[PDB]
Design a protein around this ligand. Structure first.
Ligand SMILES: CC(C)(COP(=O)(O)OP(=O)(O)OC[C@H]1O[C@@H](n2cnc3c(N)ncnc32)[C@H](O)[C@@H]1OP(=O)(O)O)[C@@H](O)C(=O)NCCC(=O)NCCS
Ligand SMILES: CC(C)(COP(=O)(O)OP(=O)(O)OC[C@H]1O[C@@H](n2cnc3c(N)ncnc32)[C@H](O)[C@@H]1OP(=O)(O)O)[C@@H](O)C(=O)NCCC(=O)NCCS
Ligand SMILES: CC(C)(COP(=O)(O)OP(=O)(O)OC[C@H]1O[C@@H](n2cnc3c(N)ncnc32)[C@H](O)[C@@H]1OP(=O)(O)O)[C@@H](O)C(=O)NCCC(=O)NCCS
Ligand SMILES: CC(C)(COP(=O)(O)OP(=O)(O)OC[C@H]1O[C@@H](n2cnc3c(N)ncnc32)[C@H](O)[C@@H]1OP(=O)(O)O)[C@@H](O)C(=O)NCCC(=O)NCCS
Ligand SMILES: CC(C)(COP(=O)(O)OP(=O)(O)OC[C@H]1O[C@@H](n2cnc3c(N)ncnc32)[C@H](O)[C@@H]1OP(=O)(O)O)[C@@H](O)C(=O)NCCC(=O)NCCS
Ligand SMILES: CC(C)(COP(=O)(O)OP(=O)(O)OC[C@H]1O[C@@H](n2cnc3c(N)ncnc32)[C@H](O)[C@@H]1OP(=O)(O)O)[C@@H](O)C(=O)NCCC(=O)NCCS
Lengths: 157, 157, 157, 157, 157, 157
């Protein structure tokens, strides 16, 4: 089997992330979305909620599974019997840092990182900015999956 | 009327900012400098002081006014009856993040962002770096308006 | 009157360019599209055709006019009684070179350059790449105005 | 089958390219190296020589094949029954242009592009720079496959 | 005497840093490594330990000395009777910010900054990332001097 | 002796280049400006004129000498008994390509490259852009040494 891991904090998952999941699922036999949480309580959604949002947003991808990650991403990737990470590039991505992490990840565990450009319509959403705008009252519903929109609306109502 | 908003925390306003104010005032019928403060108390100058410093530094621009901003910048821009933001680019600007915010701002409110390169002599000052250097004893008086220099000198004397 | 010039070779004009024209026309009282041609015969469309394509693509912008430019862009801008250039940023833009030209243009003639991020859907088209793909048989009709599509199809039929 | 195409002019193939071939072959069931030549005679090695150099440099990759490409890369990719391109990133890569081409390629044919960072030791070689240095008398043998070194040495002896 | 200062927090010193020390020592008569610590207790190693690690890692450079820095780096540089800073560039370096600091440092004290590209094999290590990986259990021993490896291993055993 | 080479085509030398010469001469015992000309006749000024312009512009730097370079820059550097190149960074510099060349130069000859940020006032001039503007009638006299201005004015009169 070919396979890739798509790691992130997904707090919450965006349509930018889902686009990347779809591309990974199209090109690898199996995809694992690895939810890697904050070292210190700082998130908007708890882990259970993050998991549910990813699952509910990926029902159309039968070769994708969702799991909570622990420790070094490369250790999680190798625990999945894989050697590839797939990550998206968007507007605002710190690409130099992504490159540094990719080189470090290859050095320590031989894990490759494949980068893919997110679809233009979803290229300016990030979890952080979506939350920031949502919390100040703005509408980002067109940039997030409906399972995320539902939960966001509940927190503000 | 044509018009633009120049948003920032201006803590304190620099000659880099003033350069941008001048360019905006030269090209739009009206300019509003929007002072948008920290979500959490972290600034050097209080809001009243920031306002005074901007006003005192822009007496030569009769079509410019200064107001405190609240909430999403785009909501403030639209409250001013405008649809444009003017921002400066300098050495050290995270341009990828500026682009992300501009695209998000256009998405949520149809507000355009126009970027302009700050004058070379003022292209390496930032509020943060100016404060950092000032607090460690260095001289940045040539990079800040005199109304700011006066107040800075008072805090150290 | 406020006013801006939108300079380019427009060979041919793209929907990326038209997006920028629209933003300029929304924020300035008058816009002049300045068609500045090759120093040496190298273009796909002659000047007459470039002019027609821009005009036919901008009939919805009553405060926009199209003229052929000559010499330094800044000299043309000043001949229009203006002091501002508006240019788009897209994926693939050499932003460092754009900044260099903007600083040079300000130095020699006091002309300001305002940069605006092109709409995501039109952020990866360029005249060159559109021609390259079109000539190799690919479909970029969704990235160009219909007046350009008509003429392109004629050259290949 | 999963599969990826690795397109390039490979004039000549470098160890940077071979590194990318190896990563693609590790993660996809099949890899096709597509040699896409100059629209106008400008190369150092003819097509037959380029093909031989790639083949001789990839004997250790049994799931990799080499073919000459024609027309749009995306048309070649789809002719291979694939929907993915794998490309390397190195020091000196114009990443903005790579992104533009990737977005265009996805737009016109639905083909995804996966980018991977080349190994540090091979991150500063390019075909052009290798030729430039080789022609001026410098030693780049540690940056090129032996099948390429042999042929290079023959051209200078 | 010609001379340069190599400033940093060195928490801990990496082989990337040592590479830069070596290049500085090769090109200047004297080199001073200036250890500039956190304004607030946040480091892994105390100052005494940082000093020892640098000294033990540079025994092969007889024209290099190690000192603790205080205040503005430029003030320290001038206190050493020098007017040059040498800094490394690696993968992940925020080069725009480095440029801003260099321009500010030249403005306030006339101190020049010379940047040098770190050796490829050491181009993806940083003190922060090395600690992050080390603390999560990963092996970065090939990226750090043995005097640092010894101390790291002691903290985890 | 410490020493550095400052290589370039200098067609013509700009005040940006002279700024870099001055910084090199301040930090190294000896500086050699190496004029490396076009592989094919394409320049505005012949080699004799380029040499004269550099010499006449550097009379205030007694530890600087001017020589015509041949072949690989690293071979010229080593022929000068040196192992360092000093190059400027300005607005518009392709820094990724500079890094690639620096890494290649270190690989083939062990020669280090030190980069320094050009003074802001001279950060947007380049030989090419200066010629382009000069030829179209614009005034760049404030960006070039008087010995260059004299010769430029002669070509247009
Ligand atoms: C999970 C992992 C791949 C990236 O996770 P991610 O949280 O999805 O990160 P993203 O790509 O969204 O990057 C944005 C993150 O940068 C951090 N960040 C904070 N401020 C930032 C800023 N101003 N600019 C850029 N990034 C910022 C944020 O935490 C942000 O997540 P958040 O802002 O939503 O909290 C990575 O953290 C990881 O591998 N973790 C496991 C540990 C490991 O292996 N470490 C060694 C890596 S070499
Ligand atoms: C006001 C606004 C336009 C930008 O404000 P600003 O404070 O002037 O920001 P600047 O352009 O100076 O950016 C620098 C800011 O980045 C933040 N920053 C902190 N560390 C940083 C770092 N290492 N690198 C870059 N930026 C950093 C800083 O807070 C800094 O301001 P400060 O450092 O002086 O406190 C923006 O915050 C805003 O729009 N706020 C309103 C809310 C809104 O609309 N949000 C949605 C935006 S899409
Ligand atoms: C008109 C002007 C503003 C820009 O014109 P433009 O042709 O629309 O340029 P773009 O922004 O589309 O830039 C792309 C151009 O870069 C040139 N280019 C060629 N190869 C390129 C490459 N590999 N990468 C980037 N650009 C490339 C191309 O000619 C391209 O136009 P084309 O490829 O479609 O022919 C500018 O040329 C100008 O001002 N000209 C007048 C003279 C002047 O004032 N000069 C002094 C300027 S400081
Ligand atoms: C094959 C293809 C994927 C890239 O091919 P490549 O030749 O290996 O290109 P590289 O990634 O090595 O890019 C370097 C190329 O940039 C060109 N280039 C020239 N000067 C350059 C410069 N100063 N800077 C950067 N690139 C330069 C060079 O030709 C160079 O190849 P070469 O210099 O060795 O001749 C692409 O050309 C392609 O897809 N061609 C088929 C046609 C197509 O589909 N077109 C539409 C694309 S959206
Ligand atoms: C010492 C000095 C030259 C740089 O020191 P340094 O700590 O070695 O900094 P580096 O080059 O390693 O930069 C990385 C630093 O950026 C800071 N940083 C934090 N988060 C970061 C992020 N997400 N991205 C980039 N940098 C980050 C970190 O603190 C990091 O050091 P650390 O992460 O290991 O703690 C500079 O701080 C200095 O000059 N200090 C003296 C005061 C002075 O003169 N100030 C005026 C400067 S103009
Ligand atoms: C001399 C040398 C150090 C750089 O020389 P330089 O001509 O001063 O180059 P610059 O730093 O000014 O770079 C700009 C050059 O890029 C070339 N260039 C052309 N179009 C360009 C573009 N669109 N963008 C960027 N650069 C461009 C130009 O020729 C330009 O010089 P010019 O435009 O004035 O003719 C380098 O060419 C060299 O080392 N030559 C000797 C041979 C060698 O050692 N080769 C192996 C190098 S690893």
């Amino acid at each position: 089997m070919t396979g890739a891991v798509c790691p992130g904090s997904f707090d919450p998952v965006t349509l930018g992330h889902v686009d990347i999941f779809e591309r990974a699922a199209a090109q690898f036999d199996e995809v694992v979305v690895a939810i890697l949480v904050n070292p210190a309580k700082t998130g908007m959604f708890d882990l259970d909620e993050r998991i549910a949002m990813v699952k509910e947003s990926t029902t159309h991808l039968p070769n994708l599974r969702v799991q909570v990650g622990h420790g070094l991403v490369v250790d999680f990737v190798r625990s999945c019997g894989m050697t590839a990470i797939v990550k998206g590039l968007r507007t605002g991505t710190d690409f130099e840092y992504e490159l540094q992490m990719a080189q470090m990840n290859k050095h320590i565990a031989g894990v490759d990182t494949f980068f893919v450009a997110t679809a233009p319509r979803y290229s300016f959403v990030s979890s952080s900015l979506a939350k920031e705008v949502a919390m100040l009252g703005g509408d980002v519903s067109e940039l997030l999956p409906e399972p995320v929109n539902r939960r966001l609306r509940d927190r503000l109502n």
